[PDB]
């Protein structure tokens, strides 16, 4: 259709003037392709997302790529639809940018692929289902004390250097190894080094063929880092709507999504609010987390990680995301620096599906007794520090004796630790977890040295390690 001409450049923000008056709608996509006519000019290819109308046929757009080298008077062409990521079977085992173009050198997606507009109206009330199905991960702590739910949103909270990315990566591997379901990974402003290391690790694991990845790099304008999660969600959307199966969606970090929203608002000229945040925060978070709903056909379960800026669970982004979670697992630096891997705090991690009728009564009883012993140990440690373990009476002695072992056995080696410590790793099904924890609770292994429990999987591995140590 008719061309439009640039009028202003203010960094990421650009303005266009469609003289004839046939304006594009909001959230549309605009394409800039230029070839230098003189030796002074540059060649640029740019994608622009409309955000506002300012009257007099002028529109205000946010750029998805660096705007350096723009010239006033150059023509802009309108696509007529939002940024359309290609979807289908062609997107499995590849890496894409926010625009849906392949970052990998393995090839270019052809025109044959069907394209899904990223921006789409949400599912309605009548469609949604309410049934609850548990997802088994094979991790002792997660399966025992914080079950995850199909279609539900699961949050991972913690500080820096505690293993959230290791947990999410090893969970992806475990799910693809055992359950075999499709998965999609969205990197919102991921470290290029960490993205490349993750790509190489998954390629070595043979998992890439089953999954799909999209990356929005930190050195890109904030709008692309905002829209990358939505394009990943559109990939999972097409998989769930047409293939009708249990898709999973992993998101690297929502914190940078909120930050990108704040930056785009500041650029657009909207008044700040809360702690410098954009005026429209709750709405955007709500949309991103309400398009992820389990209909009758497919779940679109999500696992999401969030960083706590100053160890305070009060920043607007963590609170807004906190309002939306079915299960929350928070990681502590003290556990990470201890020998206990993974670093998951039992007491502060909860799931609303831990009700006795959902998981079974035996699971509920064992989990409750585990937490009771942990609380008694935490209370008794203060007395132990000053007066020692000998001062307390026999019941407290037995309680702490079991508690140390339970804290140790909550740990296990996993396949991703091959890089870091060279151990193969183990996979424990839920029934083996509850059996082992019931056994250690009842105390048939009081004679065993505590060191046998440190990083093994099944309890017979405790027996084998006790055999090895002597």
């Amino acid at each position: 259709m008719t061309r439009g001409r640039v009028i202003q450049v203010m960094g990421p923000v650009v303005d266009v003037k469609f003289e004839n008056g046939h304006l594009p709608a909001i959230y549309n996509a605009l394409k800039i392709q230029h070839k230098a006519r003189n030796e002074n000019e540059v060649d640029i290819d740019l994608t622009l997302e409309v955000a506002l109308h300012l009257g007099d046929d002028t529109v205000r757009t946010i750029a998805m790529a660096s705007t350096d080298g723009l010239i006033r008077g150059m023509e802009v062409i309108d696509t007529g639809a939002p940024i359309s990521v290609p979807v289908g079977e062609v997107t499995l085992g590849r890496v894409f940018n926010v625009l849906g173009e392949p970052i990998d050198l393995e090839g270019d997606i052809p025109a044959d692929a069907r394209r899904d507009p990223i921006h789409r109206p949400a599912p309605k009330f009548e469609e949604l289902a309410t049934e609850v199905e548990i997802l088994e991960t094979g991790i002792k702590v997660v399966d025992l004390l914080a079950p995850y739910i199909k279609g539900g949103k699961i949050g991972l909270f913690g500080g820096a250097g505690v293993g959230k990315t290791v947990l999410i990566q090893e969970l992806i591997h475990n799910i693809a190894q055992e359950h075999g379901g499709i998965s999609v990974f969205a990197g919102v402003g991921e470290r290029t080094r960490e993205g490349n290391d993750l790509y190489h690790e998954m390629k070595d694991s043979g998992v890439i063929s089953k999954t799909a990845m999209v990356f929005g790099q930190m050195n890109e304008p904030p709008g692309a880092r905002m829209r990358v999660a939505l394009t990943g969600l559109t990939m999972a959307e097409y998989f769930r709507d047409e293939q009708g199966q249990d898709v999973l969606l992993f998101i690297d970090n929502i914190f940078r999504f909120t930050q990108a929203g704040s930056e785009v608002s500041a650029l657009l000229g909207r008044m700040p609010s809360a702690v410098g945040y954009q005026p429209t925060l709750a709405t955007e978070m709500g949309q991103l987390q309400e398009r992820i709903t389990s209909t009758a056909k497919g779940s679109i379960t999500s696992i999401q990680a969030i960083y706590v800026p100053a160890d305070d669970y009060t920043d607007p982004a963590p609170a807004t995301t906190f309002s939306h979670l079915d299960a929350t697992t928070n990681l502590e630096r003290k556990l990470a620096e201890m020998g206990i891997y993974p670093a998951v705090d039992p007491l502060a991690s909860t799931s609303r599906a831990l009700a006795p009728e959902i998981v079974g009564e035996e699971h509920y009883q064992v989990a409750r007794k585990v937490q009771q012993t942990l609380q008694r140990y935490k209370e008794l440690q203060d007395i132990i520090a000053i007066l020692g373990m000998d001062e307390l009476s026999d019941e407290d002695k037995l309680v702490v004796h079991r508690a140390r072992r339970i804290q140790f056995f909550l740990s296990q080696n996993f396949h991703v630790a091959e890089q870091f410590t060279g151990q193969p790793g183990s996979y424990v099904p839920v029934k083996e977890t509850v059996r082992g924890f019931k056994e250690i609770l009842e105390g048939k292994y009081d004679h065993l040295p505590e060191d046998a429990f440190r990083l093994v999987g099944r309890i017979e591995e405790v027996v084998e390690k006790a055999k090895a140590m002597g």
Partner: protein
Amino acid sequence: SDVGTVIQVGDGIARAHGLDNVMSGELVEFANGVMGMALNLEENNVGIVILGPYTGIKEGDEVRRTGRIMEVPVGEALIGRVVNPLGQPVDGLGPVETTETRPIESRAPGVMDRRSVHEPLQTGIKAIDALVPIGRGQRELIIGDRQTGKTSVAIDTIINQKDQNMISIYVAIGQKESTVRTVVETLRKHGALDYTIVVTASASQPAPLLFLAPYAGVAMGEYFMYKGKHVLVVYDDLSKQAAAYRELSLLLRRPPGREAYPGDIFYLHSRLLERAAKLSDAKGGGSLTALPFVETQAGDISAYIPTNVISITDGQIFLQSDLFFSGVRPAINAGLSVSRVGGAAQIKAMKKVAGTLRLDLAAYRELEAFAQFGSDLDKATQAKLARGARTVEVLKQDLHQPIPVEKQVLIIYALTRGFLDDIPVEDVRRFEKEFYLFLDQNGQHLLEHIRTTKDLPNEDDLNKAIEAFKKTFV
């Protein structure tokens, strides 16, 4: 047309008519001869920032565009020199005579060009080398309050850099020139100057030079890493860079943000820090590691800029004046310091010993917090308290005295296995130096085994050497 008059002048900013073919970021030149960058294009005016002495400009002056983007001259001859963000010497000694030039605005190496970080970067400081390792390509942040022994860490690592074949660029932003001279002299007297390049942006130089200084820093390291050599880059202050960008944005009338910062702060700092990488074996194997510095008032590292930089970096070193005046120097907070390359960027003996060292320090960190109040306690608590006290005692070292890694791992092995039990705490500092001298004279074979093998020597030889030294000490 291409020609246009200036319609406003003020505070290093101008506005111009005409210039209908200008490009964002294009260099523009005045009749006075000063240079500037076009940054804002409006419906009938252009927003120009001036890179130099602007007082001479008047209304009605004609301004014309150069037609190019700013390029930093690059060459092998820059090493040892002191240069501006622009390619002009400020050290005297005549022209530097570079080979050619590179644009500052360039794209970063993406995925499938890099590779995992696997080779260490030696600083010679026992605490950071043992508990917070750094490897080539790692973007390690250092943050703290004023005058807390920050720059001593970068200077010590640059001095120790003599061991490894790395260019160690030092970029000073917004600082007093006499400090630049003092640090240059401190480098030169220790002989490190011949593999170093110093870039100086004065507090009084026009702000756009301070805006462009870090890019001029990365340009040379990027050229060297393309050539295949290892590079280390140090920024002495990002906070002044943020202040300069805030000032130059606010003068342009761009909308403010959280703390009057414009909307582009994270974009700018990510653009700067994303060029640091570790190129794959195919590309040549170069590396461009960075050690940016961030200044913080009263240790409120939760402020906007520290949060941005800590979310961009791969680790932090938290320095506190509390430990500094506590007698523990350099004042590094082990608990709050994290590095996400911890296991890969160390030699095997360093990993083997440092794991147990970190375990002991972690236990002591919690026990000491309140064990002090109780005078009388059981024996094993006393043992753990003594272990932690000796642990912290050993880490103390002299300034401008980097230590070779092998002596580090030998003394840390002496610490971890409890060989320092007999030694009273005060004697430990003299024990470390006399132990170094004794191993230099007698136990050289251990050092030979470590330097050749890159692994811990046989247990019997190390134990015999350490006990043999322990015999002489009193």
